[PDB]
Amino acid sequence: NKITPNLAEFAFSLYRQLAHQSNSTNIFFSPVSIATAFAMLSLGTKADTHDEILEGLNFNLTEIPEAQIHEGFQELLRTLNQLTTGNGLFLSEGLKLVDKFLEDVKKLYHSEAFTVNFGDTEEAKKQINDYVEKGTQGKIVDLVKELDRDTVFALVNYIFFKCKWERPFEVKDTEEEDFHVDQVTTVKVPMMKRLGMFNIQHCKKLSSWVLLMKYLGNATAIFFLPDEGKLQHLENELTHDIITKFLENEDRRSASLHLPKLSITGTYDLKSVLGQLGITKVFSNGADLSGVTEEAPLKLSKAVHKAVLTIDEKFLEAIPMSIPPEVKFNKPFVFLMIEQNTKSPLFMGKVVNPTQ
């Protein structure tokens, strides 16, 4: 797991940017799928264009060799393959493509590349969206809304995750509860609750409750419920070592946990978003994509990421007679999904309003 620290720092730089944009919308994205997509894309780039991408993924190219970077990602794909994800490359049908790139995309990163007639904008937009919808079986519809006029290369990265808890909730105990969108305003949401033994603890550094729940597939969801007026403090203080320390501890205590059902999405323009992380040339006219096509000019004019999450109710636990704490996730909270093997950040998000 040599590239795990870089993924974690890429997750945070990506999160802190989205949280800076707007603080009133739900955030949810996959650092792993985005970084894998652009690490794979780098195989067809050279020189500054190539360096901007790996550096943009938080890889110090003067310290870690690229062989380890791609080896780390491919070793992560072997682990990762209910999680449905896909990355589609759509290239203009008039381009002479380099076989090496198409091999690397299919063999090494297990991704898909298609040739499109970008002369028909509406039909290109349809084939792109039909591909996503077919890969998510209708969960993600009409992803791409528009295409630039000079579009000759589009990238689409989708991921849909349905969480199956190790310790499930009982549907009969789910009912409507207030969700405090702020200190004086509430909104009713469906709220799951269970009295049991949880990996839960209040953290002084983070000023937050920290809940860890395993789900089926050797991965763990970490929820950070900040104290009153501590959301910004929580987001600033999060580090990979703090997260790793929590994964190490397995001690449980009793609590009456209230956790809302979640059906949230995140749709992001990777050209805009990754542009503020330093990845700009691959989207510009001076892009060195000579590993993709050898003679014609090429640039990535479209890159979209959509991530969809479903949290619901989806072994006997002995509960002491002491008064259990009441931990309600009824206000904005931060969360991550961590793969247990590689410790890599599968997903990261913030719920400002489950009903949004």
Q: Is 320 part of any domain? A: no
Report the alpha-carbon distance of residue 269 to residue 147 in Å, rounded: 12
Handedness of CA 265, 269, 275, 280 (dihedral sign): positive
Q: Do 154 and 240 lie in a common domain?
A: no
Q: Is 319 among the domain residues?
A: no
| Residue 296 lies inside a defined structural domain of this protein | yes
Domain shared by 76 and 122, yes or no: yes
Please tell me the distance from the alpha carbon of residue 324 to that of residue 342, in angstroms, as a whole number. 33
- CATH code assigned at 331: 2.30.39.10
Residues 28, 124 share a domain: yes
318 found inside a domain: no
Q: Are 125 and 210 part of one and the same domain?
A: no
Q: Are residues 306 and 235 in the same domain?
A: no
Give yes or no for a contact between 200 and 211, defined as CB atoms under 8 angstroms apart. yes
CA distance 348 to 201: 20
Instruction: Say yes or no: 281 and 244 in one domain.
Output: no
For residue 247, which amino acid is it? Answer: L
- Number of domains forming the structure of the chain: 2
Cα–chain center distance at 288:
27
Same domain, 191 and 246: yes
Residue 316 forms part of a structural domain: no
Distance CA 128, CA 318 (A): 51
What whole-number distance in Å separates Cα of residue 92 and Cα of residue 297? Answer: 11
CB 319 within 8 A of CB 194: no
Lookup result for tokens 């009441």: 326
Q: Which two tokens stand for residue 151?
A: 């579009």
Domain, as residue range, for 185: 171-259+326-351
Q: Which of 155, 116, 145 is nearest to 36 (CA)?
A: 155
What is the arrangement of strands in the sheet containing 262-269, beginning at the earlier edge strand? 112-116, 83-92, 153-162, 302-311, 262-269
Report d(CA 276, CA 53) in Å as an integer. Answer: 12
Q: What's the angle, vertex CA 161, arms to CA 272 and CA 78, rounded to 5?
A: 90
User: Closest Cα partner for 336 from 3, 28, 57, 37?
Assistant: 28
How far apart, in whole angstroms, are the C-alpha atoms of residue 337 and residue 348? 6
Determine the Cα–Cα distance for residues 339 and 345; give it in Å rounded to an integer.
7
Q: Are residues 212 and 338 in the same domain?
A: yes
Instruction: Please report how many Cα atoms fall inside a 13 Å half-sphere around the Cα of residue 145, on the Cβ side.
Output: 5
What resolution, expressed in A, was reported for this entry?
A: 1.9
306 closest CA partner among 265, 275, 264: 265
Indicate whether 289 and 153 sit together in one domain.
Answer: yes
Q: How far is the C-alpha of 12 from the C-alpha of 31, rounded, in Å?
A: 9
Classify residue 85 by burial, with Cβ atoms within 10 Å: 0-12, 13-18, 19+.
buried
Return the CATH number at 51. Answer: 3.30.497.10
Residue 54 in any domain: the answer is: yes
Quote the tokens at residue 236.
Answer: 């600033």
- Please report, for residues 53, 175, 191, 251, 254, the alpha-carbon distance to residue 312 in angstroms, rounded to integers and kept in the order given: 36, 12, 9, 24, 21
Helix axes 66-80, 31-42, angle to 10 degrees: 130
Whether residue 90 is found in the same domain as residue 152: yes
Report the DSSP beta bridge partners of residue 197. Answer: 254
Same domain for 154 and 179?
no
DSSP secondary structure code for residue 225 in this structure: E
What backbone torsions phi and psi does residue 131 show, to the nearest 5 degrees?
-70, -45
64 within a domain of the structure (yes/no):
yes
Say if 15 falls within a structural domain: yes
> Which residues precede chain breaks (C–N over 2.5 Å) in the chain?
81, 314
Q: Are 307 and 28 in contact (CB under 8 A)?
A: yes
The rounded distance, in Å, linking the Cα atoms of 325 and 338 is: 25
Q: Do 205 and 75 lie in a common domain?
A: no
Neighbours of 172 (CB within 10 A): 7
